[PDB]
Structures are given as C-alpha cells and as structure tokens.
Paper text:
Members of the ring-forming [name] family are the principal protein disaggregases in fungi ([name]), plants (Hsp101), and eubacteria (ClpB), but are absent in animal cells. [name] chaperones are multi-domain proteins consisting of an N domain, an M domain, and two AAA+ type nucleotide-binding domains, termed D1 and D2, which can be subdivided into a larger α/β domain (D1- and D2-large) and a smaller α-helical domain (D1- and D2-small). Hsp100 protein disaggregases are powerful molecular machines that harness the energy derived from ATP binding and hydrolysis to disaggregate a wide variety of aggregated proteins.
The unbiased experimental map enables tracing of residues 4 to 352. No unaccounted electron density was observed that could be attributed to bound nucleotide, irrespective of the 5 mM nucleotide (ADP or ADPNP) that was added during crystallization, suggesting that Hsp104ND1 was crystallized in the nucleotide-free state and indicating that a complete AAA+ domain featuring both the D1-large and -small domains are needed for nucleotide binding. The N domain can be divided into two repeats related by a pseudo two-fold symmetry. Surprisingly, we find that the N domain of Hsp104ND1 interacts with the C1 helix of the neighboring D1-small domain. Binding interactions are hydrophobic in nature consistent with the notion that molecular chaperones bind misfolded and aggregation-prone protein conformers that expose hydrophobic residues on their surface. N domain segments involved in peptide binding include helix A1 (Leu12, Leu15, and Gln19), helix A5 (Gly93, Leu96, Gln97, and Ala100), and additional hydrophobic residues (Phe7 and Pro88).
Author numbering: 4 to 352
Write the structure that this text describes.
Amino acid sequence: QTQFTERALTILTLAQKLASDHQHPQLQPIHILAAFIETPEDGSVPYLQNLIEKGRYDYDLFKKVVNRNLVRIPQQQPAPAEITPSYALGKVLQDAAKIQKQQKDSFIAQDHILFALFNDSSIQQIFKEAQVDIEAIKQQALELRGNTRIDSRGADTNTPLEYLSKYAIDMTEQARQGKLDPVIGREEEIRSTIRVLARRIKSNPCLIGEPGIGKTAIIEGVAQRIIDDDVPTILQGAKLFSLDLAALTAGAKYKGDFEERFKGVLKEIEESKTLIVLFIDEIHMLMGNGKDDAANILKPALSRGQLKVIGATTNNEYRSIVEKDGAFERRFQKIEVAEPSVRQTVAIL
C-alpha cells in the first residue's frame, strides 16, 4: 500500500488532462512524458528539463518531438468520460512501484515514474527521434538527489541544491541540532559582525587575525544568534553557509573547474528567496595571489545585494589584497579579532 508524492500526483493529473484535451481513448506513456515537459504553474524549472539541459542536450528539440508525436495520435470522434490506462502505461506504474522498493524509498516520486518510463519502447524511440541519449538522462537522475532518501511526500523537488550541498556547510541547521558550543568572551566581536551585516553600505564583514584564534567561534556565535531570532530585521530567517575550499579543490583537475563550481555555488545563492550569508575562511586564497577569475565572480554578486559575505584573513594578507584592489576595500568592513590575552589587555588600557 504505497502512496505517491505530491509532484508525482501532479504528473498523473496533467497526463490525464492532456489526454482529455487531445481526446484520446486511453492514457499512454506519451502523456506522462508530455506532462513532464509541461511548464509548472509557478514558472519553476521542470524536473525533466533540468536533467536534459544539464546533460547539455537540446531541450527545445526534445519538446518539439514529444508534441508532434502526441499530435500524431488520432483523435477519437466522441470524447468519452472514461480515460482508462493502456496496457503499456499499466506496466509503467507497476514498474515504478518496484523501482521505489528497490531504492528503499517511502513514496513513489517523479524519479521512479521517469525510470519506469525509460523502459517502455514507446518513449525509447521518442528519445532516439529527439537525439537524446536516454542512458545519460538516467545517470543525471541518479546523481541529482545524491544519496538522500525520499522520506516525505514532498522530498522529490525538481531542482535540488547541487553546489551548496557539495561545497558548503549549513551552519544554521547545524546550530538547531545543538552541534555547536558557545565560546565565552567574544560577544562584543559578534555584535560588530552582525552590525555590519545589517548595514547597507559595506555590509560584508572581514575578520582579521591569525587562524585558530577564535574566528570560527565568532561565526558559530552568529549562527546561533540567527536561530533564536536575536538579529536585526534584515537577518531574520537567513541561512549561514560555510564555503569549503577543500571540497571545491578536491576533484577539480581541469582548467576552469574551480571557477565553475564557485559560480554554481553563487548562482544557487542569488536565486534563493531567503537572504544567505556566505562565510569564506582564508578569503585571500580566492581574491589574492593574482586570482582574478574568482574575484570577478564574487565582486559582481556582492553588488546585486542578494549575497552577503563574511571574510576571514590575516592582517598582512588583507593589506595585500587592498593594496591592489580598491573595489574590494569599499565592500568589506574590517573587524579585528585578537587573542583573548590581548583582548583583555587592550580593554584595560
């Protein structure tokens, strides 16, 4: 007694509606495929379009082939009120159920219907006529969700986050689960970091000091201050991600791979409806040492306003960046982070 997901039910609903508009006797796999290439109600990217476009195929050609093959189906003269499923479609629904149990999922989703679709010879010649490798789209569907199982009725989102999951860590959700420890003696420097983020000019703080001094403790303090809603109006409901440069580097063995991954992370941020503050440790390994390509990706994104960045570097390394990039100095506010022994002495003097 398995149940469908909300998006899977929408596909079967659109397929039932498309067969009714074309007045076709029975529901066929071509209808479900036509429901996949259908533009969603909210203008979001369809699930199948993302797989095909990221596979670097011509999606417009694919739509044109599916439509001309569906119009090729003759229209019955008197439209009945009973659109039964065909024998070919019955196997698809039965095949999607075993695909769900094969992957140990709790619900039948778009993926399972799409996988069971790939087995029908009707849609197999559709992909061949559209010159789209059907086995490459299958690989795209496998890599998409990763290894996260489908537990809820709405776990099969069309375009899940691919770059923010591989090369970033959500510090906010990690703070909700009590995986962080509040370090003492740094609330004054946390207050300054949040004050800069609420600003509209130079809204990107940059922590200055030697690594391992408590910089990571300040970021974890800002995250837990966003969770309990102790932040100004602008930061209410904002997620705090941490860019993993080691993950960006591992596997990038081709020229431009690092920039492509970094551009993909920023793209998922700028399209997010909620404001996202990205923390970049050792930011000099991005904006300095003659790395102009990475700088030309972050600087325009900061101007659009959707992204706020918390940088972290040493004093001499920050001065090295500013000495050859005035535009960087006008977007980042300097915040000095000293060792507790030095922080206590300065306050006494």
